[PDB]
Structure 1
Amino acid sequence: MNIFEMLRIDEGLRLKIYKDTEGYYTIGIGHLLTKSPSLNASKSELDKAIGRNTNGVITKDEAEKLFNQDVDAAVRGILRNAKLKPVYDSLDAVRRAALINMVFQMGETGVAGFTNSLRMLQQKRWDEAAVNLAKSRWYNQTPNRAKRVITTFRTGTWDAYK
């Protein structure tokens, strides 16, 4: 198991524009297009992201290409962020993947705000961090995915994904 496989399970794959859990226009493997309520605006963002007149449909390779860019972006975002970098650096390989998952979902800013949880993780207080992580909108809105990520941090294994 690795970050790509992990996120592919969490986000799924859709080749046609769809609305995510929040009602936002998305495509491929969790690639957010726009938060705007306009389908056309999303089709325009899509064409701009792909480099062609897509007409709201993309191929598998194209979806995969957006995914590679998005994962790379998340990692680089973490490394550039003063609040995240130190945590990331303190973690083992598996938990690093859990941190990347959250950033991919909520954006670096979003995650940077789980101040207390971040400190617990850095301290290696696994059980406490899992408890703190659960008291959040994130957990309440996407409980199954959140549970998978939290188990990952708590155990340091890929058990929730097997």
Structure 2
Amino acid sequence: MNIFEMLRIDEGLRLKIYKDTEGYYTIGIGHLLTKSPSLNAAKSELDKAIGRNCNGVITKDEAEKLFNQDVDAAVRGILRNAKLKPVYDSLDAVRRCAAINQVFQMGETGVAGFTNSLRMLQQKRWDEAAVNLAKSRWYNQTPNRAKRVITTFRTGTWDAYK
């Protein structure tokens, strides 16, 4: 297992513009296009991203390309964040994949506010962190996915991803 396979499992793959779990326009492998409710805004953003007139639909290769850039961006966002970087570098390789996944899903922003859990993860208090992490809007709105990530942080293995 690796980050790509893991996220590909959590986000799925769709070649036509769709609404995510929060109702925002998205495409490919969880690539948010816009938070605005105007589809046109979304189509414009798509075109801009891909570099061509898509008419709301892309190819697999196009989706995968966006995915690549998006993973990279997330990692790079982690690294540049003063509160995140130190936690991230203290973790082992599997748990770092759990960190990327949360950041990919919620933004460096959302994650940066998990101060307490962050500290627990840094101290290697696995079970305490798992309980803390569950006390969130994130776990309550997307519990199945949150559970998988949390078990990942808790155990340091890919068991939740089987």
TM (norm. structure 2) is 1.00
Matched, 1:128 2:128: yes
Q: Deviations over 1:11-60 (max 9, x none)?
A: 00000000000000000000000000000000000000000000000000
Counterpart-to-counterpart distance in 2, 1:118 and 1:47: 37
1:83 Cα offset (Å): 0.5
Aligned length: 162
Q: Deviations over 1:101-121 (max 9, x none)?
A: 000000001100000000000
Counterpart-to-counterpart distance in 2, 1:93 and 1:3: 10
1:7 Cα offset (Å): 0.1
1:141 Cα offset (Å): 0.1
Match of 2:16 in 1: 16
1:145 Cα offset (Å): 0.1
1:135 Cα offset (Å): 0.2
Counterpart-to-counterpart distance in 2, 1:76 and 1:20: 24
* Partner SS, residue 116 of structure 1: helix
Counterpart-to-counterpart distance in 2, 1:22 and 1:51: 26
TM (norm. structure 1) is 1.00
Identity %: 97
Q: Deviations over 1:106-146 (max 9, x none)?
A: 00011000000000000000000000000000000000000
Which consecutive unaligned segments of at least 5 residues does structure 2 have? none
After TM superposition, where is structure 1 displaced by more than 6 Å over at least 4 residues in a row? none
Counterpart-to-counterpart distance in 2, 1:78 and 1:66: 18
Counterpart-to-counterpart distance in 2, 1:83 and 1:37: 32
Match of 1:66 in 2: 66
Which consecutive unaligned segments of at least 5 residues does structure 1 have? none
Counterpart-to-counterpart distance in 2, 1:6 and 1:96: 12
Query: How much is the aligned-residue C-alpha RMSD, in angstroms?
Result: 0.2
Counterpart-to-counterpart distance in 1, 2:158 and 2:38: 38
1:161 Cα offset (Å): 0.2
Counterpart-to-counterpart distance in 1, 2:12 and 2:109: 24
Counterpart-to-counterpart distance in 2, 1:161 and 1:62: 26
